[PDB]
C-alpha cells in the first residue's frame, strides 16, 4: 500500500553536510515550489438538506484553508420553498461574510478569501424567519474551495469533501447468559461481550521508533486512554446501568495505519421499568440493552453492525427464561447541550416455562376442586360435611405449600384471583353442607336432594364462565 | 447596585421510578434527574483562546470543579442521603457569556423518619426529597423552578405505591456558621393498592367467620363442636398462610 503523513525536506547545493540530515539554512535560495506556477486545484461538493419544523437551523464545518485560498457557496431550492438566509462565520462565531440575493432571485451566493495562517470556517443556513410550520422544505447546497465556476461546474464533484465527515464506528454485542431477574425492583442481570472498531489516522505511528506492529493498552477504559493520549476517542456507557460494572479482558490495540478496536467482557445489571407482570405466569417480557456514545454525532457515529458470534448463546441444561426472538438496531437520541448521540439497542423476547407451572399448580388444584364437587352424590350429609371441612383445610395446606411460587408484588395477578375464587367456592360448599344437614334434620330430604342436583349442575359452569371471563379480560 | 447581590439559581427535579420502600428501617429509594442553571461573568472566556464555544467538565462533582478552577460554585447535597449515591451522565458546561448549567441522573436512598404505619394497610405516606445548597444565601440562592419533564413519570405495569399528588417549594433553613441556605423540597403523596389487600384477606376471613356463625342452627351439638374445632384450625391455617 501507499503511506500518508507529514514530512520535512532539506535540499542542498554543493553542501556535503546535507546528507547528515542536520544542514542549517544558509546562502541564497535556489529552488521553489512547482505548483505555484499554475492555477491551484479545485474541490467541489454538493449536498441535499431539509429544514424540518424543529430543525430550521443547520451548520456545517469546513476543513482548514491555507492563506490565499478562496471559498464559494450557493443555495437553490428544490421547488417552491422560500429562499433561506446564508452566512459564514469562524469556529468562534465571528461573522465573516453574508449571502447576497442575485437579480434572478432564485439563489443566494457567498464569497470569501483567506488571510490568516489557518482559517476554520462554518457555514450557517437557517430558515427561521418567523414561526411558520411550512413542513418539508428541501434545498440543494453547492460549495467549493478554489472553485469560482460553481455556477456552471459541469464536472461531477471532484477532489475531496469540503465539509468534514464523522468517524464511522462498527459495533457488535453478544449475550451469553441471563443470570437473574428481580421482579420487585424491576431489574435484570446479563453476561456478554462487547466489541468496537474504528479507523483514525491520527492514532497511527511509525514502526521504526518501536520495532513493532501492534501497540496495545490494557485494563483501562476508553476515557482514561483518551485522557492519557490527548486524543478524542469514542467513549460509551450503558444507559440503564445500576451500580458498578464488572469487566474482564479489557484491551485497546492499534495498528500503524490507524485501525483501532476495543474488546470487553462484562457482567452488568440493568433497570427495566417497562416490566408488566399482570398476566403472570403467562406474561411475556422484553429485555432491552442500550449502548449510547458519549460524544456528539458530528464526531463519531455508529455505521454498521457486526455479528462476530451468535447474539444469543446456547448453554447446557434448561433455563427459566426462553428466548423466542431478538433484534438489533441503530438509532439517534437527543443529547445534552443539543446535537445528537448514537444508540445501539439489543432486544430479547422471553417467556416462562409453562409446563412447570401447569403441572406443579393447576392439576392438584383441579383434583382438590373435584374432591369438593364429588361429595354431593352422598345422601348421608354428616359425611359430606366432614369431608368438606377436611377438604377446606387440605386446600389451605396446598395453597401455603405452593406459596413459594407466588410473587409478592403488591398487586393482583391471575393466579391470586383464581386461588381466591377457588377458596371462596370451597367455603360456600361447607356452608351449603351445613344447610343441607339442618334441612335433613328437620325432615325435608327432598329439598336437600334438589339442592344437591342444583350444585352439581351449577359449579363446573361457574368455573368455566370465570375462566372465559379471565381470558377475555386479560388475553384479548 | 451599591450592595452586592446574590447569584440566582434555577433548579428542577423529576422522579422516574420508586424502586423500594423499607418499612422497618424507614427509608426508600428513588431514581430521577436533577438540573441546575445559573449565570456568572467570572466564568466567561474568549473563544479565540480555545477555538470552541462550549467548555465542558465531565464525571466530576461541583466541589471538584470548583476546587480545580479556584472559583466559588453552587454545590449541593441531599439532606437525608443514606450511604453513597450512584450518578450517571454528570456534566458541567459553560458558555462564553458565563451561563453555566449542571445535569445528573441519580439513584439514591433517603431516610424517612416521618413514616407512620398505624393505619396499615389503609395508611397514607409522604415521600419528601430535599436538596440543600452548601453555601450561604448571600452567595447563591434558588430563585426559580424549571419543569423540564414531568415530575412523576408513567411506567408500564402496575405499582405497589400510587402517587396521588405532588408539590414543589423553595424555602430557607438555618445554616452552620450562621447565615442561611436555600432548600428545594419535592413531596409525593402515595397510597397502597387496596383491592389487593381487600380481595386477598378480608373476603376469606369473612367466609371463615360465617362458617363459624352458621353452625348454631344445628341441634346436634356434637357435630357443632366438631365443626367448630375444625374451623378454629382452618382459621389458624389461613392466618399463618
Ligand atoms: C367441578 C369438577 C369437575 C367435575 C366434572 C364435572 C363434569 C360435568 C358433569 C355434570 C353432571 C351432572 C349430574 C347431575
Ligand atoms: C356473623 C357472620 C354474618 C352472618 C350474617 C348475619 C346477619 C344477621 C342475621 C340475624 C339472624 C338471627 C336469627 C335468630
Ligand atoms: C386448574 C384449574 C381447574 C379449575 C376447575 C375446572 C372446572 C372445569 C369444569 C368443566
Ligand atoms: C353468610 C352466609 C349466610 C348463610 C345462611 C344459612 C341459612 C341456614 C338456616 C337453616
Ligand atoms: C394464554 C393462557 C390463558 C390463560 C387463561 C385462563 C387462566 C385461568 C386462571 C389461572
Ligand atoms: C415448558 C413446556 C411448555 C408448555 C408445555 C405444556 C405441557 C404441559
Ligand atoms: C388429571 C388432572 C387434570 C388437571 C387439569 C387442569 C390443568 C390444565
Ligand atoms: C374476584 C374475586 C371474587 C371473590 C369471591 C367470589 C365468590 C364466588
Ligand atoms: C386498587 C383498587 C383500589 C380499591 C378498589 C376497591 C375494589 C375492591
Ligand atoms: C369487605 C370484605 C368483607 C365482605 C366479604 C364478602 C364475601 C362474599
Amino acid at each position: 500500500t501507499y503511506t500518508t503523513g507529514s514530512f520535512q525536506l532539506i535540499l542542498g547545493l554543493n553542501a556535503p553536510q546535507v546528507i547528515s540530515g542536520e544542514g542549517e539554512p544558509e546562502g541564497e535560495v535556489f529552488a521553489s515550489l512547482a505548483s505555484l506556477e499554475i492555477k491551484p486545484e479545485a474541490h467541489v461538493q454538493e449536498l441535499e438538506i431539509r429544514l424540518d419544523k424543529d430543525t430550521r437551523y443547520l451548520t456545517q464545518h469546513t476543513r482548514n484553508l491555507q492563506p490565499g485560498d478562496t471559498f464559494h457557496a450557493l443555495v437553490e431550492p428544490i421547488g417552491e420553498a422560500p429562499l433561506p438566509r446564508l452566512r459564514l462565520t469562524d469556529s468562534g462565531g465571528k461573522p465573516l461574510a453574508f449571502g447576497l440575493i442575485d437579480q434572478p432571485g432564485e439563489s443566494v451566493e457567498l464569497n470569501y478569501t483567506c488571510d490568516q495562517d489557518i482559517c476554520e470556517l462554518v457555514v450557517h443556513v437557517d430558515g427561521t424567519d418567523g414561526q411558520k410550520d411550512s413542513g418539508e422544505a428541501v434545498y440543494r447546497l453547492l460549495v467549493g474551495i478554489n472553485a469560482p465556476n460553481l455556477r456552471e461546474s459541469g464536472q461531477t464533484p471532484v477532489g475531496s469533501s469540503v465539509f468534514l465527515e464523522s468517524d464511522l464506528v462498527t459495533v457488535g454485542l453478544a449475550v451469553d447468559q441471563i443470570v437473574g431477574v428481580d421482579q420487585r425492583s424491576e431489574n435484570f442481570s446479563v453476561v456478554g461481550t462487547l466489541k468496537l472498531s474504528w479507523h483514525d489516522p491520527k492514532l497511527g505511528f511509525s514502526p521504526d521508533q518501536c520495532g513493532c506492529t501492534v501497540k496495545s493498552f490494557e485494563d483501562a477504559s476508553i476515557r482514561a486512554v483518551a485522557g492519557e493520549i490527548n486524543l478524542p476517542l469514542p467513549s460509551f456507557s450503558f444507559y440503564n446501568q445500576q451500580g458498578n460494572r464488572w469487566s474482564q479482558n479489557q484491551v485497546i490495540f492499534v495498528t500503524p495505519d490507524g485501525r483501532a478496536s476495543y474488546f470487553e467482557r462484562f457482567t452488568v445489571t440493568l433497570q427495566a421499568p417497562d416490566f408488566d407482570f399482570l398476566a403472570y405466569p403467562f406474561d411475556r417480557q422484553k429485555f432491552s440493552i442500550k449502548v449510547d456514545l458519549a460524544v456528539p454525532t458530528n464526531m463519531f457515529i455508529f455505521n454498521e453492525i457486526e455479528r462476530f458470534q451468535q447474539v444469543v448463546g446456547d448453554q447446557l441444561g434448561e433455563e427459566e427464561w426462553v428466548v423466542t426472538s431478538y433484534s438489533q438496531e441503530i438509532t439517534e437520541v437527543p443529547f445534552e447541550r443539543g446535537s445528537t448521540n448514537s444508540r445501539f439497542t439489543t432486544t430479547l423476547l422471553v417467556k416462562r416455562n409453562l409446563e412447570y407451572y401447569i403441572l406443579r399448580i393447576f392439576v392438584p388444584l383441579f383434583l382438590i376442586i373435584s374432591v369438593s364437587w364429588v361429595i354431593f352424590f352422598l345422601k348421608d350429609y354428616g359425611r359430606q360435611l366432614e369431608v368438606a371441612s377436611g377438604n377446606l383445610l387440605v386446600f389451605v395446606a396446598f395453597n401455603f405449600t405452593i406459596s413459594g411460587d407466588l410473587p409478592r408484588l403488591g398487586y393482583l395477578t391471575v393466579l391470586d384471583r383464581f386461588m381466591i375464587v377457588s377458596f371462596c367456592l370451597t367455603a360456600i360448599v361447607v356452608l351449603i353442607s351445613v344447610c343441607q344437614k339442618r334441612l335433613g334434620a328437620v325432615g325435608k330430604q327432598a329439598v336437600a336432594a334438589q339442592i344437591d342436583t342444583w350444585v352439581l349442575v351449577i359449579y363446573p359452569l361457574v368455573y368455566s364462565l370465570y375462566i372465559i371471563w379471565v381470558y377475555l379480560r386479560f388475553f384479548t
Side-chain angles (χ1 to χ4, degrees), chain A residues 1-37 40 42-128 130-157 159-164 166-476:
Chain A
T1 41
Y2 286 107
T3 55
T4 67
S6 62
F7 63 91
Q8 179 185 240
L9 178 61
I10 298 180
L11 293 187
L13 180 51
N14 300 337
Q17 75 285 6
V18 176
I19 48 181
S20 62
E22 302 177 0
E24 207 178 2
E26 65 180 1
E28 51 185 354
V29 303
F30 59 98
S32 60
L33 262 296
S35 181
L36 271 300
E37 306 174 5
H43 316 300
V44 178
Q45 187 202 216
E46 190 176 15
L47 290 180
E48 178 180 355
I49 55 101
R50 169 179 167 179
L51 297 180
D52 297 329
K53 301 179 180 180
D54 303 331
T55 323
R56 286 171 289 185
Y57 207 104
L58 180 60
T59 56
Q60 291 295 313
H61 280 56
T62 312
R63 53 181 294 183
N64 293 17
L65 270 69
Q66 275 62 29
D69 297 334
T70 59
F71 189 86
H72 292 254
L74 60 93
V75 50
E76 179 180 0
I78 274 288
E80 210 179 4
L83 298 178
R85 293 182 183 174
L86 188 70
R87 62 179 67 92
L88 182 68
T89 60
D90 73 326
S91 298
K94 227 282 179 52
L96 297 178
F98 191 78
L100 309 185
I101 286 85
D102 52 356
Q103 306 171 359
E106 302 177 358
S107 178
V108 181
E109 57 186 6
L110 190 145
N111 184 23
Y112 182 72
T113 174
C114 175
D115 299 331
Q116 293 79 29
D117 51 355
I118 44 180
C119 278
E120 303 178 359
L121 305 181
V122 177
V123 179
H124 305 261
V125 63
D126 59 328
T128 321
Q131 295 182 355
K132 301 179 181 180
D133 297 359
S134 60
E136 308 180 358
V138 53
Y139 312 92
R140 298 179 65 92
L141 181 60
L142 184 58
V143 59
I145 293 180
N146 300 339
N149 305 332
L150 288 186
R151 298 182 179 180
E152 297 180 358
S153 180
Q155 300 178 353
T156 60
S160 300
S161 179
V162 182
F163 292 148
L164 292 183
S166 316
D167 196 2
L168 308 179
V169 183
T170 302
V171 73
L173 185 141
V175 172
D176 297 331
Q177 177 189 3
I178 302 178
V179 287
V181 174
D182 197 330
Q183 298 178 171
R184 282 189 56 90
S185 180
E186 299 186 10
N187 61 81
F188 68 99
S189 301
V190 73
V191 181
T193 311
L194 183 61
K195 182 180 179 180
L196 285 79
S197 181
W198 72 100
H199 178 48
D200 191 5
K202 298 294 296 298
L203 275 69
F205 56 96
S206 191
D208 41 318
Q209 281 73 52
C210 58
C212 296
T213 321
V214 176
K215 178 182 179 182
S216 61
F217 305 90
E218 299 177 353
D219 301 330
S221 60
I222 299 183
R223 307 171 185 267
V225 181
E228 286 183 1
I229 69 182
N230 291 268
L231 286 180
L233 296 180
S235 60
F236 64 91
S237 62
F238 287 85
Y239 184 71
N240 297 278
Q241 177 175 333
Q242 177 73 9
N244 291 325
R245 185 173 73 256
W246 167 251
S247 301
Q248 288 183 142
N249 301 90
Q250 189 173 9
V251 58
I252 306 181
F253 45 92
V254 194
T255 57
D257 287 329
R259 293 174 282 98
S261 58
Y262 174 78
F263 185 86
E264 178 188 349
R265 288 160 47 91
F266 58 90
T267 301
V268 74
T269 302
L270 304 178
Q271 302 178 1
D274 299 359
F275 278 168
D276 187 9
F277 306 104
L278 205 62
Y280 179 88
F282 305 94
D283 54 326
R284 311 183 75 92
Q285 306 295 335
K286 303 185 184 298
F287 291 167
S288 60
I289 309 176
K290 303 179 184 301
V291 178
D292 297 358
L293 289 180
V295 293
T297 180
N298 55 269
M299 299 178 58
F300 294 90
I301 180 180
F302 287 145
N303 185 262
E304 295 180 3
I305 300 179
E306 173 184 353
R307 311 171 187 176
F308 58 95
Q309 292 176 9
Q310 293 188 359
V311 180
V312 43
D314 58 328
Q315 302 292 346
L316 298 180
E318 302 293 336
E319 283 73 20
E320 185 180 3
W321 297 90
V322 178
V323 181
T324 62
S325 60
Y326 64 90
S327 58
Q328 289 180 330
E329 193 179 1
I330 298 179
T331 51
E332 293 183 348
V333 293
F335 188 61
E336 297 295 331
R337 187 37 77 173
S339 181
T340 309
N341 67 277
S342 299
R343 168 172 293 181
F344 177 62
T345 305
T346 300
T347 304
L348 307 179
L349 306 190
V350 294
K351 67 176 182 178
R352 298 181 184 272
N353 193 272
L354 215 61
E355 178 187 3
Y356 173 74
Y357 292 94
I358 290 177
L359 268 57
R360 183 174 168 84
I361 298 180
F362 293 105
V363 181
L365 211 65
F366 175 80
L367 288 177
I368 295 179
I369 295 175
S370 301
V371 171
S372 299
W373 173 80
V374 74
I375 63 182
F376 283 88
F377 287 106
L378 299 176
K379 292 300 172 297
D380 188 9
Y381 298 102
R383 289 290 183 179
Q384 173 182 338
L385 175 57
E386 184 177 0
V387 176
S389 60
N391 191 260
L392 182 60
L393 184 62
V394 172
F395 184 91
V396 180
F398 175 79
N399 180 26
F400 177 80
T401 300
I402 72 177
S403 172
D405 297 330
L406 209 66
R408 297 183 296 267
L409 305 178
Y411 51 91
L412 289 176
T413 60
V414 182
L415 199 58
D416 309 330
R417 303 174 186 269
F418 197 87
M419 296 298 296
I420 294 169
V421 174
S422 188
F423 185 91
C424 293
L425 295 181
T426 313
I428 295 178
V429 168
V430 182
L431 292 178
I432 298 175
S433 298
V434 176
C435 181
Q436 284 184 324
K437 178 61 174 58
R438 182 51 188 172
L439 277 177
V442 193
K444 295 185 179 181
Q445 310 173 359
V447 183
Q450 199 164 352
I451 295 177
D452 286 329
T453 58
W454 280 348
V455 172
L456 287 170
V457 172
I458 283 179
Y459 259 59
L461 180 62
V462 175
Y463 270 106
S464 60
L465 287 182
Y466 182 78
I467 295 181
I468 291 300
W469 183 33
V470 169
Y471 175 81
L472 256 59
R473 68 202 286 255
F474 284 115
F475 297 90
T476 187

